[PDB]
Design an enzyme around this catalytic site. Structure first.
Site, mmCIF file in Angstrom:
data_model
loop_
_atom_site.group_PDB
_atom_site.id
_atom_site.type_symbol
_atom_site.label_atom_id
_atom_site.label_comp_id
_atom_site.label_asym_id
_atom_site.label_seq_id
_atom_site.Cartn_x
_atom_site.Cartn_y
_atom_site.Cartn_z
ATOM 1 N N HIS A 106 -43.353 51.550 39.624
ATOM 2 C CA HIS A 106 -44.178 51.506 40.781
ATOM 3 C C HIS A 106 -45.469 50.717 40.588
ATOM 4 O O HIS A 106 -46.296 50.671 41.502
ATOM 5 C CB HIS A 106 -44.394 52.908 41.397
ATOM 6 C CG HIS A 106 -43.137 53.480 41.952
ATOM 7 N ND1 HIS A 106 -43.036 54.739 42.469
ATOM 8 C CD2 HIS A 106 -41.898 52.947 42.106
ATOM 9 C CE1 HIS A 106 -41.814 54.940 42.882
ATOM 10 N NE2 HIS A 106 -41.115 53.885 42.662
ATOM 11 N N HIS A 135 -31.701 51.129 39.990
ATOM 12 C CA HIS A 135 -30.646 51.913 40.644
ATOM 13 C C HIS A 135 -29.286 51.750 39.978
ATOM 14 O O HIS A 135 -28.519 52.714 39.945
ATOM 15 C CB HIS A 135 -30.563 51.590 42.102
ATOM 16 C CG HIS A 135 -31.687 52.205 42.875
ATOM 17 N ND1 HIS A 135 -31.563 52.614 44.170
ATOM 18 C CD2 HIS A 135 -32.944 52.520 42.504
ATOM 19 C CE1 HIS A 135 -32.660 53.241 44.541
ATOM 20 N NE2 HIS A 135 -33.545 53.125 43.592
HETATM 21 C C1 HEM Z 1 -39.168 60.042 41.031
HETATM 22 C C2 HEM Z 1 -38.536 58.860 40.873
HETATM 23 C C3 HEM Z 1 -38.565 57.803 41.916
HETATM 24 C C4 HEM Z 1 -38.499 57.891 43.278
HETATM 25 C C5 HEM Z 1 -38.372 59.137 44.167
HETATM 26 C C6 HEM Z 1 -38.577 56.564 43.781
HETATM 27 C C7 HEM Z 1 -38.585 56.238 45.101
HETATM 28 C C8 HEM Z 1 -38.615 54.940 45.631
HETATM 29 C C9 HEM Z 1 -38.537 54.592 46.991
HETATM 30 C C10 HEM Z 1 -38.383 55.586 48.135
HETATM 31 C C11 HEM Z 1 -38.652 53.212 47.080
HETATM 32 C C12 HEM Z 1 -38.673 52.401 48.365
HETATM 33 C C13 HEM Z 1 -37.300 51.762 48.741
HETATM 34 C C14 HEM Z 1 -37.621 50.932 49.920
HETATM 35 O O1 HEM Z 1 -37.999 51.474 50.997
HETATM 36 O O2 HEM Z 1 -37.562 49.647 49.796
HETATM 37 C C15 HEM Z 1 -38.837 52.751 45.750
HETATM 38 C C16 HEM Z 1 -39.062 51.437 45.463
HETATM 39 C C17 HEM Z 1 -39.203 50.897 44.190
HETATM 40 N N1 HEM Z 1 -39.023 51.621 43.033
HETATM 41 FE FE1 HEM Z 1 -38.992 53.649 42.862
HETATM 42 N N2 HEM Z 1 -38.729 55.676 42.717
HETATM 43 C C18 HEM Z 1 -38.499 56.370 41.546
HETATM 44 C C19 HEM Z 1 -38.458 55.829 40.269
HETATM 45 C C20 HEM Z 1 -38.464 54.479 39.943
HETATM 46 C C21 HEM Z 1 -38.220 53.956 38.687
HETATM 47 C C22 HEM Z 1 -37.870 54.781 37.478
HETATM 48 C C23 HEM Z 1 -38.308 52.592 38.740
HETATM 49 C C24 HEM Z 1 -38.166 51.563 37.719
HETATM 50 C C25 HEM Z 1 -38.474 51.616 36.459
HETATM 51 C C26 HEM Z 1 -38.619 52.297 40.114
HETATM 52 C C27 HEM Z 1 -38.883 51.072 40.691
HETATM 53 C C28 HEM Z 1 -39.082 50.723 41.991
HETATM 54 C C29 HEM Z 1 -39.508 49.419 42.496
HETATM 55 C C30 HEM Z 1 -39.859 48.222 41.672
HETATM 56 C C31 HEM Z 1 -39.564 49.517 43.859
HETATM 57 C C32 HEM Z 1 -39.964 48.456 44.858
HETATM 58 C C33 HEM Z 1 -38.809 47.718 45.527
HETATM 59 C C34 HEM Z 1 -39.275 46.518 46.327
HETATM 60 O O3 HEM Z 1 -40.343 45.931 46.057
HETATM 61 O O4 HEM Z 1 -38.428 46.139 47.206
HETATM 62 N N3 HEM Z 1 -38.770 53.465 40.840
HETATM 63 N N4 HEM Z 1 -38.902 53.796 44.901
#
Ligand code: HEM
Ligand code: HEM
Lengths: 735, 734
Positions: free
Chosen positions: B265, B92
């Site tokens: 993810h 982010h």
């Molecule tokens: C279309 C693009 C993406 C969307 C819409 C998206 C959406 C989200 C959402 C809704 C969450 C959950 C937040 C929460 O409720 O804690 C999340 C978590 C996460 N995202 Fe994505 N994401 C995107 C791209 C990415 C990218 C590019 C990365 C990193 C390279 C990333 C890494 C992460 C990680 C590691 C988590 C887990 C956080 C945790 O374990 O607390 N995401 N994402």
């Protein structure tokens, strides 16, 4: 668009929804980021005083005088003389001053910036400022705009036959709009612009003494009062009550008020030749072709006989370019009828009067006597009437009072007389200048400073906490807006400060008595050298800071500048000084805010008046806590087990996540810090303490000082900020 | 109450109606007053690179890695490991970047300030930043928050089984909110926050490629796209169109995009355990007791099994703390059904799948596979599906693409490679770094500079005006937000800049050919000494300024810093550089405003990107006019009879009240100055010219330079500002 929104939404240069839009209640630090040296085109090392001392002052005044009668075709002079217009320009420059908060006035030259350049009451003073530009162009950096606007009025009066007491320069220009001033909360200008400041009361006689503090004008956009009567109702009696309130809020009494209005309205005329629908946008809303001017009038050439400024068409005297007693004579000896100007506004005419008031563009044509409702006010109040009747028959008494009041109006926010520059500063001292005496004795030297620090620290009843607290209590009365307050004078020892509850009078008395023993021991045992109580208050805090740094492991020089003097009670006016009394003090954890200004907002406002940056505010608060320097010696905010030692423990402990903070009373002022693991209460804090861990920009600074590593830096930065604050009012010293 | 207004109207600390309220369309200079040295608690003298290079970098990483598995009771770690949270924090921070304007990204550490700290999509990243604060506390000034937030995600990947390419530090902290960024014009956040950016279209397919420029997110308050689909419509195919658009606007292509999403993810989970009504105000709206945190959850302790962040409750893989191919394997092999999370959001579940996805707080309890609508997008678009299919079978290819894309995400606003600090800077040069070669031959000295200045000022095709224009055209491509552009590289001589209309291509070609003649004459006739075209372009302009000063009666040394290199065209991607093309350039009197921004607004924006203060912007414009340095050689704004001489005549004549200014074009862009006495037209001006006589703060500066006696000061100030602009990209000298 609705209010405060542009119909076109810019996508450049700060366009777009901003943080203040999403979270408009959040504390903003903007007022601590104004007037920075980068922003000043002259440079941070520019010394105005030094430049003004090289000015050919006499030649400036000669050129001003010449310009008064050199009519320019783009804005022809009434009667061939811009004097009246120039008097108005200077009176409006100085006339925004408010005594309670010390803001407004002419001392920053703010008429040339938003919003004052575009207030309705400043209509066509864009032309006045443009007419005097060639003087500024000729003399360059050696006269400020601030000084020139007021000098121009003073010269104008002198050249129209009114000898003033003199003049002082010294107002350095500013370079951006001062967005720290609370001009009101209304979202409209005069003729509206006053629902908030009257709390929605419309009963004009009853409400007149109920104007919202600290304001000093009856509508947003006006200098003092509405010239057509309160809310435009043409009732001179009620207008008088407004005038008293407004002028009182500006620090003027009845004698001063009548002198100023009858003095000023000897000169010139009003302008109300054509309807307002013919007038274009004010300068901040005008197109680029206007080149900083506004109020373009589409009738004719928009000027000369078609001039429209207020919408009134009043010529007060038969000789508008020469001092006279015609104003009072007309006011009292004519019978007045309510009439309409050519633009439709309410004024008064002597409809059976003589037809001998000159027309401004025809030397052979005349009109009858006219007055504003706010002029008739002065014979429709018992106190004003008595003064007007006396001066009618004794015009020298008017002249005397006008000279004194005019001087006070122009110089109210200049500060001490050591700031006043030029060859005609009046010799008489006046109470509103917060006068100071000449010094008793020769100046103490460095060896005397070192002996006095040791003597203060070894004196019974004095300790690091009390010494630092006392010095800061004395220093933070300073306010940059009108250059009032500070440590010079030792006014903390005088009424009213010695009894301010925020100074803990019983403790302050014992501190001062112990400093006066140090004084007595020094004075008379050091030859001709003598030390003032003012210097001992500041030296005692200085010595305490030095000792607190040494006791934290840091040997640092804490600079001290000797030479303050001790004021007398006769030089220290209770009313004037009451205006400096804080309702909350975040440096010493005193008091609290109210609904419309929170504790931490008061602190930021105070810091702006001390010229502090965000880092300097933050280091001072945290150091004061480490020193145990609260006004009553409480432990609120004293997040340290090394009280009296100059450490960043306040920051370290504030950001420790093992502490959880919760509110202790209903009003959100008191907070308890609980250790999460043990569940035991560890700390008590105030809003002034906890804002540094909550506001994102302040917290970022708190974290700097909490970083393992920045301990020496914390001492260095505290000492720099301490030195700055102690020396704010040291205009007697140069560089 | 009304949008943008507090119910309680403060009377302190800037409270009250303000000039921007009364005249909201007036030009504002605020963006030229940010980031002042007096505001920086570290001091203006503070040198971050020197501090960082003394940092015990390996120990920092070691402490981050240990923190990952040191659960804190006020925000317990999912699965015992903060790695996913930290990856999200980093992503982010870096993920707000927009390629077209170069704004956003992680390089200023702005997540810690408003508004980013309180965007919906950054919910609970306040806790993430708070968990890393003890590292920042321990190491002090030697690592910035900006570097630490990204390093922490880097280290998290490496400690969860994913070897990255490396890392570079160098991001100095900032100390106030950057209020120059245009995030959009909407007055709501996601789930709303997008009427303006789609021009009120709600046709989710048809509008997807029509997202307002230069925006790179589909709602105010989001990083890229809505995880519940376009406007919350759970349609993966349409979501894919938004993803392509948004990631494209961030500079990422299809392979980069799938690699980032599928890579990210692999880790962690989303949080949607309780309904949104239980959640308190974001950080900027929260009470003092929150101490900079927000989104207080009133259910239980608000944390652990009750965590609520996005409203979704998805666990992508069976091993959320370890790199795997589980994301693509689940995405492709499962059958997906639309379901509701506990908070009420819609997501996808494999309702007939294995019950073997771990619960974050109970090692004995398991769930079925889940995915977001935005994850299903990747198998509901033809190009994304092809990539997903290939990497299902060849997961090493995903790992290689993700390493490269993650590195680009974290570093593209870091600037030139000379800014990258630390011991693990990747060796591969990437096109998005705008690479530069090492120097050719030995460095010119002051004797060589003196000879070159004399040659340049007597070469066919060159003159003061042309040289000054050309040097400024090359310099003003610099933008401080992502540290792109400037004079190093002589990229004005390459595509696309050499054919920008704003550079007057035929005049530029004759100027460059003349400078290349001087180059050829010097190179090879001075032993192993060689001079770059980039140094000659800046030297030529600098020599021209010096001579123009001399001709105005001021003898001043105009300092020159040698050592620029020439980029090759291979190092100069033409699409990447197209993003630096100006709409308007007020220094050279080029261009015009748009329906959204006036000419003078664009000029102030550019000045902010150059780090100019209002006096520096003002002095430069007036000097460029005196020099006759317009892009087209015209007389517009050239209010002097002494063109090519560095006098303050622009200002003197602009403020002469014997000149009346009136509009000439319908479009507001052109103005004529008429002598009031003779009725004769004397001058033509632009908005960039006339703003200095209209805006009250700018006019106050114009007046200083128009005052008698300030002719030397004008030259001095112009030379300082010139030197500052010429040297903005000289990170090699640091
Ligand atoms: C279309 C693009 C993406 C969307 C819409 C998206 C959406 C989200 C959402 C809704 C969450 C959950 C937040 C929460 O409720 O804690 C999340 C978590 C996460 N995202 Fe994505 N994401 C995107 C791209 C990415 C990218 C590019 C990365 C990193 C390279 C990333 C890494 C992460 C990680 C590691 C988590 C887990 C956080 C945790 O374990 O607390 N995401 N994402
Ligand atoms: C109750 C307080 C006052 C009110 C309501 C008031 C109101 C006004 C108004 C409405 C005008 C006409 C503006 C126009 O149409 O051109 C004006 C003009 C003027 N006022 Fe006052 N005034 C007050 C106090 C003062 C004071 C204190 C001074 C100076 C000591 C001053 C000096 C002048 C002068 C000299 C002019 C004539 C300007 C010219 O000739 O262009 N007035 N006043």
């Amino acid at each position: 668009t609705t209010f405060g929104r542009c119909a076109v939404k810019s996508n450049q240069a700060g366009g777009g929804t901003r943080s203040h839009d999403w979270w408009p209640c959040q504390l903003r630090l903007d007022v601590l980021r104004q007037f920075q040296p980068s922003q000043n085109p002259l440079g941070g090392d520019f010394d105005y005083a030094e430049a003004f001392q090289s000015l050919d002052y006499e030649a400036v005044k000669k050129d001003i005088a010449a310009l008064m009668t050199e009519s320019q075709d783009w804005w022809p002079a009434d009667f061939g003389n811009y004097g009246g217009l120039f008097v108005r320009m200077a009176w409006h420059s100085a006339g925004t001053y408010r005594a309670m908060d010390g803001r407004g006035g002419g001392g920053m030259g703010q008429q040339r910036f938003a919003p004052l350049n575009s207030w309705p009451d400043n209509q066509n003073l864009d032309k006045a400022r443009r007419l005097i530009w060639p003087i500024k162009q000729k003399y360059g950096n050696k006269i400020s705009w601030a000084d020139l606007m007021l000098l121009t009025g003073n010269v104008a009066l002198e050249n129209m036959g009114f000898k003033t007491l003199g003049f002082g320069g010294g107002r350095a220009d500013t370079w951006q709009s001062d967005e720290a001033v609370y001009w009101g909360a209304e979202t409209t200008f005069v003729p509206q612009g006053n629902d908030v400041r009257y709390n929605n009361s419309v009963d004009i006689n009853a409400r007149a003494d109920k104007l919202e503090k600290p304001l000093a004008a009856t509508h947003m956009g006006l200098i003092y009062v509405n010239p057509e009567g309160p809310n435009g109702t043409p009732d001179p009696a009620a207008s008088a009550k407004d005038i008293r309130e407004a002028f009182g809020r500006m620090g003027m009494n009845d004698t001063e008020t009548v002198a100023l209005i009858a003095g000023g309205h000897a000169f010139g005329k009003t302008h109300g030749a054509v309807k307002g629908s013919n007038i274009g946008p004010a300068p901040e809303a005008a197109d680029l072709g206007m080149q900083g001017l506004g109020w373009h009038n589409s009738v004719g050439d928009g000027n000369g006989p078609n001039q429209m400024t207020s919408g009134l068409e009043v010529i007060w005297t038969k000789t508008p370019t020469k001092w006279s007693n015609g104003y009072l004579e007309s006011l009292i000896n004519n019978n007045w009828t309510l009439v309409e100007s050519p633009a439709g506004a309410h004024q008064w005419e002597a409809v059976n009067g003589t037809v001998d008031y000159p027309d401004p563009f025809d030397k052979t044509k005349f009109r009858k006597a006219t007055m504003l409702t706010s002029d008739l006010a002065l014979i429709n109040d018992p106190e004003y009437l008595k003064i007007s009747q006396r001066w009618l028959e004794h015009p020298e008494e008017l002249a005397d009072a006008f000279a004194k009041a005019w001087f006070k109006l122009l110089h109210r926010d200049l500060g001490p007389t050591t700031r006043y520059l030029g060859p005609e500063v009046p010799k008489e001292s006046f109470i509103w200048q917060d006068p100071l005496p000449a010094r008793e004795g020769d100046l103490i030297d460095d060896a005397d400073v070192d002996k006095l620090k040791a003597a203060i620290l070894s004196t019974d009843g004095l300790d690091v906490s009390k010494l630092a607290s006392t010095a800061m209590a004395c220093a933070t009365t300073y306010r940059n807006s009108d250059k009032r307050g500070g440590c010079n004078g030792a006014r903390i020892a005088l009424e009213p400060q010695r009894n301010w509850v925020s100074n803990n009078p019983t403790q302050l008395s014992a501190v001062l008595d112990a400093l006066k023993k140090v004084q007595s021991d020094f004075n008379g045992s050091n030859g001709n050298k003598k030390v003032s109580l003012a210097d001992l208050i500041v030296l005692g805090g200085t010595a305490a800071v030095e000792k607190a740094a040494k006791d934290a492991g840091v040997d640092i020089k804490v600079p001290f500048s000797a030479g303050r003097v001790d004021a007398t009670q006769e030089q220290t006016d209770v009313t004037q000084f009451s205006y400096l009394e804080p309702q909350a003090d975040g440096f010493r954890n005193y008091g609290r805010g109210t609904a419309r200004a929170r504790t931490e907002e008061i602190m930021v406002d105070k810091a702006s008046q001390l010229t502090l940056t965000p880092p300097e505010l933050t280091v001072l608060v945290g150091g004061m806590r480490a020193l145990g320097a609260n006004y009553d010696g409480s432990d609120v905010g004293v997040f340290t087990a090394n009280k009296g030692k100059l450490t960043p423990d306040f920051f370290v402990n504030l950001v420790d996540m093992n502490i959880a903070w919760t509110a202790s009373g209903a009003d959100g002022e008191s907070w308890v810090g609980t250790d999460r693991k043990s569940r035991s209460e560890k700390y008590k804090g105030s809003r002034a303490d906890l804002v540094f861990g909550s506001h994102a920009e302040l917290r970022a600074i708190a974290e700097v000082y909490a970083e393992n590593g920045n301990q020496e830096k914390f001492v260095k930065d505290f000492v720099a900020a301490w030195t700055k604050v102690m020396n704010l009012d040291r205009f007697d010293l140069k560089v």
